[PDB]
Amino acid sequence: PVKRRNAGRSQKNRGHTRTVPCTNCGRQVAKDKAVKRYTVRDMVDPSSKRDIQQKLAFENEKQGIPKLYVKLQYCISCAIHSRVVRVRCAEDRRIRRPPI
Amino acid sequence: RTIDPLSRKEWYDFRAPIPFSSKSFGKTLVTKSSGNRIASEEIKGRVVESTLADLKDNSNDKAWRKVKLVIDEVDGRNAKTSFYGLDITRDRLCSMIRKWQTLIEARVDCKTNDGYIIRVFTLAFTKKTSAGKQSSTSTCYAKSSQVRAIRRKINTFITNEAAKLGIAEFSKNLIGEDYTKKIEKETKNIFPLQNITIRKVKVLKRPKLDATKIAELYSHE
Amino acid sequence: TEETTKARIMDVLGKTGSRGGITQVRVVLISGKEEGRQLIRNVKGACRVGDVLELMECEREARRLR
Amino acid sequence: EVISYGPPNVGANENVFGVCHIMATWNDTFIHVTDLSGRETLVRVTGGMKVKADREESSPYAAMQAAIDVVNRCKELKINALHIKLRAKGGVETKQPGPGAQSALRALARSGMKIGRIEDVTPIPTDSTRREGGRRGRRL
RNA sequence: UAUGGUACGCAAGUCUGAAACUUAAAGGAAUUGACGGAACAGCACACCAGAAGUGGAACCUGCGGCUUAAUUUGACUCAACAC
Ligand SMILES: [Mg+2]
Ligand SMILES: [Mg+2]
Ligand SMILES: [Mg+2]
Ligand SMILES: [Zn+2]
């Protein structure tokens, strides 16, 4: 019972692909296999934002607080446990560009 | 409290070199002279990391350009500084980094006639023309060979524009948008590029400044 | 800091809280310092449309429900 | 009276700029002010200073207490505004700043401290030495 | 695996490679259940806003122990125990 046709990794036309340590655990995982999400968040709770934007010395800031950039790479055990990815029915299992 | 730990500390106002505002930007702390320790001489090598908070008119939009300065001189309770480095905020970088285009990077080593050896890193990105939203479908990559020609060209041009200018000149040009314009004009044949950037500048080998040239660097209007 | 604003509910929007004990609500202000401003607030207790609410901060605005 | 061994000549218009290096770990938080050079250190506060429990070292309560101590101490050095340089342990380790990050940043301004330019400097390998985990990471 | 290798290897071992004996199953995909220290979604005074409280006391009345000649006996999570 082959489960995935992909077999989980996006890799074809090569023998080997570089291994990446998982953010959460640090387990080595295939770069194709890895669940990788790029995150641009803000360093600060919106309330906290109000508080700081009051006190910003340079008034020449328009959204003059930096965003936090993360390239997040999960091993499978981790990205499942941590709900980044979750179990779906056989038919949906092949759906490719899902979010909102 | 008993004996505030800063009891012995003298303060100095930083002064910026010729491309920047003559007005002091920050202030620094140092311990008083001990009769061995000479107050002014403990500061000979210090390094200042600032934005352009340093160009009064033009500053406010560029929080993206970091400038390192090094203190060449102490004059009368205020510390003069010469050029040390150029750089970029994390933000202004990961700002520019997008999937589905090619990331070009170009490193160069150059000499001023001022006697400086500099290392300039340049950054550039593939510019999509085709008018869609760049995506998994909208792939923008440029051929590796085109990348190589782009390096060769950028690099060459910089070494040329370096050898003919003083470090005052060179730094002024470097901070601002001149080189980006020119670089796009050279590069465009090979491939259209977007947000050309000078990622960093390092100063490899710096001569010491005669009183003359350090006066001519100061030269403020 | 004591400063206070009267807030009248235009719409009852959601229902929310871990136990589900709170109501989400849309609000028009009557203070006179800020009039006709609209806000989204989380209210504990039972509310209809067109109640009045005593609000200590018109800056805190509640995260909408999805 | 008050002898502040901070800077000689100020005004009410003037801004006095210190720099705050803030390190947030899953295990602790650091609020550290220096001059624009980074050489001369002004104030130093760790979470562990502010709590006796090893586990609370990182927490927001600790970060808060830390922050207010720092602020109180800059205030007498006549310092209005800190630039902020934020850091997680970084390098090969995690790049997500710890819990104390936000809390300390807030409590700093909450305390009536102006806030200058903000940058994240977290150490970022072009490439890495090998990670402290197993080949298989932390199991459990 | 045993054994034989004018097959290899410094070694680890690699390659070649049995039979006696024993056994009716082992095995493949898929269905339905049941289960899960997986994901999601319902419903109930389950929890939530509350109240009256038991648990603490004396006593009453059940269980269990323990004594007893005998302390008849069934019934132990809701789903035994003023049954
Ligand atoms: Mg292989
Ligand atoms: Mg194409
Ligand atoms: Mg570890
Ligand atoms: Zn993991």
Side-chain angles (χ1 to χ4, degrees), chain A residues 1-4 7 11-12 19-21 34 48 51 56 58-59 62 71 81 86-89 97-98:
Chain A
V2 195
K3 185 155 166 168
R4 278 148 214 116
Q11 165 220 24
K12 343 263 278 195
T19 178
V20 218
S48 220
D51 304 18
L56 284 188
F58 307 93
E59 204 47 37
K62 303 223 167 187
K71 167 121 171 201
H81 179 48
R86 69 185 87 180
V87 189
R88 23 191 230 171
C89 127
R97 297 291 180 184

PDB file of all heavy atoms in Angstrom, chain A residues 1-4 7 11-12 19-21 34 48 51 56 58-59 62 71 81 86-89 97-98:
ATOM      1  N   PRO A   1       0.850  -1.179   0.000  1.00  0.00           N
ATOM      2  CA  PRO A   1       0.000   0.000   0.000  1.00  0.00           C
ATOM      3  C   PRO A   1       0.891   1.236   0.000  1.00  0.00           C
ATOM      4  O   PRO A   1       1.221   1.782   1.054  1.00  0.00           O
ATOM      5  CB  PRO A   1      -0.728  -0.131   1.342  1.00  0.00           C
ATOM      6  CG  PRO A   1       0.219  -1.002   2.216  1.00  0.00           C
ATOM      7  CD  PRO A   1       1.398  -1.372   1.344  1.00  0.00           C
ATOM      8  N   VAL A   2       1.314   1.647  -1.184  1.00  0.00           N
ATOM      9  CA  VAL A   2       1.934   2.938  -1.325  1.00  0.00           C
ATOM     10  C   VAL A   2       0.886   3.934  -0.857  1.00  0.00           C
ATOM     11  O   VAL A   2      -0.263   3.888  -1.310  1.00  0.00           O
ATOM     12  CB  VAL A   2       2.299   3.205  -2.789  1.00  0.00           C
ATOM     13  CG1 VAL A   2       3.273   4.372  -2.896  1.00  0.00           C
ATOM     14  CG2 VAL A   2       2.879   1.930  -3.431  1.00  0.00           C
ATOM     15  N   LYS A   3       1.265   4.795   0.085  1.00  0.00           N
ATOM     16  CA  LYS A   3       0.348   5.788   0.657  1.00  0.00           C
ATOM     17  C   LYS A   3       0.337   7.050  -0.198  1.00  0.00           C
ATOM     18  O   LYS A   3      -0.704   7.465  -0.711  1.00  0.00           O
ATOM     19  CB  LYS A   3       0.718   6.118   2.102  1.00  0.00           C
ATOM     20  CG  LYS A   3      -0.280   7.061   2.765  1.00  0.00           C
ATOM     21  CD  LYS A   3      -0.306   6.917   4.288  1.00  0.00           C
ATOM     22  CE  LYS A   3      -1.042   8.079   4.944  1.00  0.00           C
ATOM     23  NZ  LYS A   3      -1.330   7.812   6.381  1.00  0.00           N
ATOM     24  N   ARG A   4       1.503   7.674  -0.314  1.00  0.00           N
ATOM     25  CA  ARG A   4       1.675   8.798  -1.223  1.00  0.00           C
ATOM     26  C   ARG A   4       2.398   8.399  -2.494  1.00  0.00           C
ATOM     27  O   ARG A   4       3.294   7.552  -2.472  1.00  0.00           O
ATOM     28  CB  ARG A   4       2.465   9.919  -0.560  1.00  0.00           C
ATOM     29  CG  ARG A   4       1.641  10.812   0.319  1.00  0.00           C
ATOM     30  CD  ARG A   4       2.453  11.343   1.476  1.00  0.00           C
ATOM     31  NE  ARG A   4       1.608  11.489   2.651  1.00  0.00           N
ATOM     32  CZ  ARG A   4       1.758  10.806   3.779  1.00  0.00           C
ATOM     33  NH1 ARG A   4       2.753   9.930   3.907  1.00  0.00           N
ATOM     34  NH2 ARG A   4       0.919  11.018   4.790  1.00  0.00           N
ATOM     35  N   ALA A   7       5.497  10.152  -2.119  1.00  0.00           N
ATOM     36  CA  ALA A   7       6.231   9.546  -1.022  1.00  0.00           C
ATOM     37  C   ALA A   7       6.701  10.606  -0.025  1.00  0.00           C
ATOM     38  O   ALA A   7       7.614  10.364   0.767  1.00  0.00           O
ATOM     39  CB  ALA A   7       7.393   8.723  -1.534  1.00  0.00           C
ATOM     40  N   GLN A  11      11.238  15.699  -4.156  1.00  0.00           N
ATOM     41  CA  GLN A  11      12.420  15.402  -4.953  1.00  0.00           C
ATOM     42  C   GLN A  11      12.227  14.388  -6.080  1.00  0.00           C
ATOM     43  O   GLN A  11      11.804  13.252  -5.842  1.00  0.00           O
ATOM     44  CB  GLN A  11      13.525  14.909  -4.025  1.00  0.00           C
ATOM     45  CG  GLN A  11      14.676  14.224  -4.711  1.00  0.00           C
ATOM     46  CD  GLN A  11      15.159  13.023  -3.924  1.00  0.00           C
ATOM     47  OE1 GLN A  11      14.410  12.448  -3.131  1.00  0.00           O
ATOM     48  NE2 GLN A  11      16.413  12.639  -4.134  1.00  0.00           N
ATOM     49  N   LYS A  12      12.551  14.812  -7.304  1.00  0.00           N
ATOM     50  CA  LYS A  12      12.708  13.913  -8.459  1.00  0.00           C
ATOM     51  C   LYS A  12      13.884  14.390  -9.323  1.00  0.00           C
ATOM     52  O   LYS A  12      14.329  15.530  -9.182  1.00  0.00           O
ATOM     53  CB  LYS A  12      11.422  13.841  -9.307  1.00  0.00           C
ATOM     54  CG  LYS A  12      10.141  14.340  -8.618  1.00  0.00           C
ATOM     55  CD  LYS A  12       9.317  13.210  -8.004  1.00  0.00           C
ATOM     56  CE  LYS A  12       8.445  12.530  -9.053  1.00  0.00           C
ATOM     57  NZ  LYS A  12       7.380  11.676  -8.447  1.00  0.00           N
ATOM     58  N   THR A  19      20.256  17.667   3.836  1.00  0.00           N
ATOM     59  CA  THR A  19      19.463  17.470   5.046  1.00  0.00           C
ATOM     60  C   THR A  19      19.479  18.694   5.963  1.00  0.00           C
ATOM     61  O   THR A  19      20.518  19.319   6.178  1.00  0.00           O
ATOM     62  CB  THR A  19      19.891  16.195   5.817  1.00  0.00           C
ATOM     63  OG1 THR A  19      19.119  16.078   7.016  1.00  0.00           O
ATOM     64  CG2 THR A  19      21.382  16.226   6.173  1.00  0.00           C
ATOM     65  N   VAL A  20      18.315  19.024   6.508  1.00  0.00           N
ATOM     66  CA  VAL A  20      18.181  20.204   7.347  1.00  0.00           C
ATOM     67  C   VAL A  20      17.768  19.787   8.750  1.00  0.00           C
ATOM     68  O   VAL A  20      16.951  18.882   8.913  1.00  0.00           O
ATOM     69  CB  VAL A  20      17.089  21.125   6.800  1.00  0.00           C
ATOM     70  CG1 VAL A  20      17.487  22.574   6.959  1.00  0.00           C
ATOM     71  CG2 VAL A  20      16.836  20.814   5.350  1.00  0.00           C
ATOM     72  N   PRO A  21      18.335  20.445   9.773  1.00  0.00           N
ATOM     73  CA  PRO A  21      17.912  20.211  11.158  1.00  0.00           C
ATOM     74  C   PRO A  21      16.550  20.836  11.407  1.00  0.00           C
ATOM     75  O   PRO A  21      16.334  21.973  10.991  1.00  0.00           O
ATOM     76  CB  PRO A  21      18.962  20.955  11.986  1.00  0.00           C
ATOM     77  CG  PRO A  21      20.070  21.296  11.038  1.00  0.00           C
ATOM     78  CD  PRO A  21      19.444  21.407   9.689  1.00  0.00           C
ATOM     79  N   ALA A  34      10.874  18.194   4.388  1.00  0.00           N
ATOM     80  CA  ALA A  34      10.621  19.146   5.468  1.00  0.00           C
ATOM     81  C   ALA A  34       9.367  19.968   5.261  1.00  0.00           C
ATOM     82  O   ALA A  34       9.064  20.386   4.145  1.00  0.00           O
ATOM     83  CB  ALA A  34      11.793  20.085   5.601  1.00  0.00           C
ATOM     84  N   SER A  48       0.875  45.886  23.148  1.00  0.00           N
ATOM     85  CA  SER A  48       2.261  46.261  23.337  1.00  0.00           C
ATOM     86  C   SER A  48       2.680  47.224  22.219  1.00  0.00           C
ATOM     87  O   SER A  48       3.464  48.156  22.439  1.00  0.00           O
ATOM     88  CB  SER A  48       3.118  44.994  23.329  1.00  0.00           C
ATOM     89  OG  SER A  48       4.145  45.041  24.288  1.00  0.00           O
ATOM     90  N   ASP A  51       1.481  50.720  23.117  1.00  0.00           N
ATOM     91  CA  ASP A  51       2.413  51.229  24.128  1.00  0.00           C
ATOM     92  C   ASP A  51       3.737  51.734  23.543  1.00  0.00           C
ATOM     93  O   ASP A  51       4.187  52.826  23.886  1.00  0.00           O
ATOM     94  CB  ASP A  51       2.678  50.175  25.202  1.00  0.00           C
ATOM     95  CG  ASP A  51       1.405  49.692  25.862  1.00  0.00           C
ATOM     96  OD1 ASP A  51       0.322  49.913  25.277  1.00  0.00           O
ATOM     97  OD2 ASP A  51       1.482  49.092  26.957  1.00  0.00           O
ATOM     98  N   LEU A  56       7.930  56.014  20.554  1.00  0.00           N
ATOM     99  CA  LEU A  56       8.923  55.997  19.483  1.00  0.00           C
ATOM    100  C   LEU A  56       9.508  57.386  19.264  1.00  0.00           C
ATOM    101  O   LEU A  56       8.785  58.345  18.986  1.00  0.00           O
ATOM    102  CB  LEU A  56       8.324  55.445  18.190  1.00  0.00           C
ATOM    103  CG  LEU A  56       8.138  53.924  18.168  1.00  0.00           C
ATOM    104  CD1 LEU A  56       7.728  53.429  16.786  1.00  0.00           C
ATOM    105  CD2 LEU A  56       9.416  53.241  18.633  1.00  0.00           C
ATOM    106  N   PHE A  58      11.544  58.622  16.996  1.00  0.00           N
ATOM    107  CA  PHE A  58      11.576  59.167  15.651  1.00  0.00           C
ATOM    108  C   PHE A  58      10.192  59.065  15.032  1.00  0.00           C
ATOM    109  O   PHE A  58       9.727  57.977  14.688  1.00  0.00           O
ATOM    110  CB  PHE A  58      12.623  58.442  14.814  1.00  0.00           C
ATOM    111  CG  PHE A  58      13.985  58.413  15.455  1.00  0.00           C
ATOM    112  CD1 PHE A  58      14.377  57.341  16.243  1.00  0.00           C
ATOM    113  CD2 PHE A  58      14.874  59.460  15.275  1.00  0.00           C
ATOM    114  CE1 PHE A  58      15.623  57.312  16.832  1.00  0.00           C
ATOM    115  CE2 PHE A  58      16.120  59.438  15.864  1.00  0.00           C
ATOM    116  CZ  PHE A  58      16.496  58.362  16.642  1.00  0.00           C
ATOM    117  N   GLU A  59       9.553  60.222  14.871  1.00  0.00           N
ATOM    118  CA  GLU A  59       8.161  60.316  14.434  1.00  0.00           C
ATOM    119  C   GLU A  59       8.035  60.063  12.932  1.00  0.00           C
ATOM    120  O   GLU A  59       6.932  60.029  12.375  1.00  0.00           O
ATOM    121  CB  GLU A  59       7.601  61.692  14.778  1.00  0.00           C
ATOM    122  CG  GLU A  59       6.095  61.719  14.915  1.00  0.00           C
ATOM    123  CD  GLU A  59       5.605  60.580  15.763  1.00  0.00           C
ATOM    124  OE1 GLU A  59       6.301  60.237  16.746  1.00  0.00           O
ATOM    125  OE2 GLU A  59       4.534  60.019  15.446  1.00  0.00           O
ATOM    126  N   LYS A  62       6.785  55.264   9.606  1.00  0.00           N
ATOM    127  CA  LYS A  62       5.471  54.818   9.168  1.00  0.00           C
ATOM    128  C   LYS A  62       5.562  53.304   9.111  1.00  0.00           C
ATOM    129  O   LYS A  62       6.221  52.754   8.226  1.00  0.00           O
ATOM    130  CB  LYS A  62       5.124  55.415   7.805  1.00  0.00           C
ATOM    131  CG  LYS A  62       5.175  56.931   7.778  1.00  0.00           C
ATOM    132  CD  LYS A  62       4.002  57.519   7.013  1.00  0.00           C
ATOM    133  CE  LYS A  62       3.877  59.022   7.263  1.00  0.00           C
ATOM    134  NZ  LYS A  62       2.639  59.605   6.663  1.00  0.00           N
ATOM    135  N   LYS A  71      12.471  31.599   8.652  1.00  0.00           N
ATOM    136  CA  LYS A  71      12.204  30.456   7.792  1.00  0.00           C
ATOM    137  C   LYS A  71      12.180  29.220   8.674  1.00  0.00           C
ATOM    138  O   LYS A  71      13.208  28.794   9.206  1.00  0.00           O
ATOM    139  CB  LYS A  71      13.193  30.310   6.636  1.00  0.00           C
ATOM    140  CG  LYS A  71      13.087  28.951   5.955  1.00  0.00           C
ATOM    141  CD  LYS A  71      12.742  29.036   4.478  1.00  0.00           C
ATOM    142  CE  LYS A  71      12.872  27.659   3.825  1.00  0.00           C
ATOM    143  NZ  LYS A  71      13.044  27.730   2.346  1.00  0.00           N
ATOM    144  N   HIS A  81       2.733  16.647  15.328  1.00  0.00           N
ATOM    145  CA  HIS A  81       2.477  16.883  16.751  1.00  0.00           C
ATOM    146  C   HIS A  81       2.058  18.323  17.005  1.00  0.00           C
ATOM    147  O   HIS A  81       1.059  18.579  17.666  1.00  0.00           O
ATOM    148  CB  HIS A  81       3.745  16.604  17.554  1.00  0.00           C
ATOM    149  CG  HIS A  81       3.591  16.840  19.018  1.00  0.00           C
ATOM    150  ND1 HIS A  81       2.524  16.349  19.736  1.00  0.00           N
ATOM    151  CD2 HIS A  81       4.368  17.510  19.900  1.00  0.00           C
ATOM    152  CE1 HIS A  81       2.649  16.709  21.002  1.00  0.00           C
ATOM    153  NE2 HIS A  81       3.760  17.415  21.127  1.00  0.00           N
ATOM    154  N   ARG A  86      -1.893  18.747   9.494  1.00  0.00           N
ATOM    155  CA  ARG A  86      -2.669  17.697  10.138  1.00  0.00           C
ATOM    156  C   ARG A  86      -3.376  16.718   9.207  1.00  0.00           C
ATOM    157  O   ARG A  86      -3.604  16.992   8.026  1.00  0.00           O
ATOM    158  CB  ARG A  86      -3.618  18.267  11.193  1.00  0.00           C
ATOM    159  CG  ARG A  86      -4.761  19.086  10.647  1.00  0.00           C
ATOM    160  CD  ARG A  86      -5.571  19.690  11.784  1.00  0.00           C
ATOM    161  NE  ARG A  86      -5.042  20.968  12.247  1.00  0.00           N
ATOM    162  CZ  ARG A  86      -5.581  21.679  13.230  1.00  0.00           C
ATOM    163  NH1 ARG A  86      -6.654  21.229  13.863  1.00  0.00           N
ATOM    164  NH2 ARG A  86      -5.047  22.838  13.583  1.00  0.00           N
ATOM    165  N   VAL A  87      -3.714  15.574   9.794  1.00  0.00           N
ATOM    166  CA  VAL A  87      -4.230  14.408   9.103  1.00  0.00           C
ATOM    167  C   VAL A  87      -5.445  14.713   8.261  1.00  0.00           C
ATOM    168  O   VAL A  87      -6.432  15.239   8.764  1.00  0.00           O
ATOM    169  CB  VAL A  87      -4.684  13.374  10.136  1.00  0.00           C
ATOM    170  CG1 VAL A  87      -5.016  12.057   9.456  1.00  0.00           C
ATOM    171  CG2 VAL A  87      -3.623  13.208  11.219  1.00  0.00           C
ATOM    172  N   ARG A  88      -5.392  14.358   6.984  1.00  0.00           N
ATOM    173  CA  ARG A  88      -6.550  14.550   6.123  1.00  0.00           C
ATOM    174  C   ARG A  88      -6.972  13.287   5.368  1.00  0.00           C
ATOM    175  O   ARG A  88      -6.180  12.363   5.162  1.00  0.00           O
ATOM    176  CB  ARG A  88      -6.337  15.721   5.165  1.00  0.00           C
ATOM    177  CG  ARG A  88      -4.892  16.070   4.911  1.00  0.00           C
ATOM    178  CD  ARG A  88      -4.805  17.391   4.179  1.00  0.00           C
ATOM    179  NE  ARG A  88      -3.943  17.304   3.001  1.00  0.00           N
ATOM    180  CZ  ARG A  88      -3.827  18.266   2.092  1.00  0.00           C
ATOM    181  NH1 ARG A  88      -4.519  19.392   2.225  1.00  0.00           N
ATOM    182  NH2 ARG A  88      -3.026  18.101   1.052  1.00  0.00           N
ATOM    183  N   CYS A  89      -8.232  13.281   4.951  1.00  0.00           N
ATOM    184  CA  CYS A  89      -8.834  12.162   4.256  1.00  0.00           C
ATOM    185  C   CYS A  89      -8.120  11.914   2.938  1.00  0.00           C
ATOM    186  O   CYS A  89      -7.489  12.818   2.388  1.00  0.00           O
ATOM    187  CB  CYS A  89     -10.321  12.447   4.020  1.00  0.00           C
ATOM    188  SG  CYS A  89     -10.868  12.272   2.314  1.00  0.00           S
ATOM    189  N   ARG A  97      -2.665  23.717  -3.402  1.00  0.00           N
ATOM    190  CA  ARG A  97      -2.626  25.100  -2.909  1.00  0.00           C
ATOM    191  C   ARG A  97      -3.899  25.539  -2.160  1.00  0.00           C
ATOM    192  O   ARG A  97      -4.703  26.300  -2.700  1.00  0.00           O
ATOM    193  CB  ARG A  97      -2.350  26.066  -4.065  1.00  0.00           C
ATOM    194  CG  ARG A  97      -0.996  25.874  -4.737  1.00  0.00           C
ATOM    195  CD  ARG A  97       0.140  26.273  -3.803  1.00  0.00           C
ATOM    196  NE  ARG A  97       1.465  26.116  -4.407  1.00  0.00           N
ATOM    197  CZ  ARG A  97       2.610  26.326  -3.760  1.00  0.00           C
ATOM    198  NH1 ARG A  97       2.597  26.701  -2.485  1.00  0.00           N
ATOM    199  NH2 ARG A  97       3.769  26.159  -4.385  1.00  0.00           N
ATOM    200  N   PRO A  98      -4.077  25.046  -0.912  1.00  0.00           N
ATOM    201  CA  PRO A  98      -5.228  25.176   0.008  1.00  0.00           C
ATOM    202  C   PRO A  98      -5.578  26.488   0.773  1.00  0.00           C
ATOM    203  O   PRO A  98      -6.774  26.770   0.893  1.00  0.00           O
ATOM    204  CB  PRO A  98      -4.977  24.052   1.038  1.00  0.00           C
ATOM    205  CG  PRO A  98      -3.695  23.369   0.611  1.00  0.00           C
ATOM    206  CD  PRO A  98      -2.977  24.333  -0.250  1.00  0.00           C
TER     207      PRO A  98
END
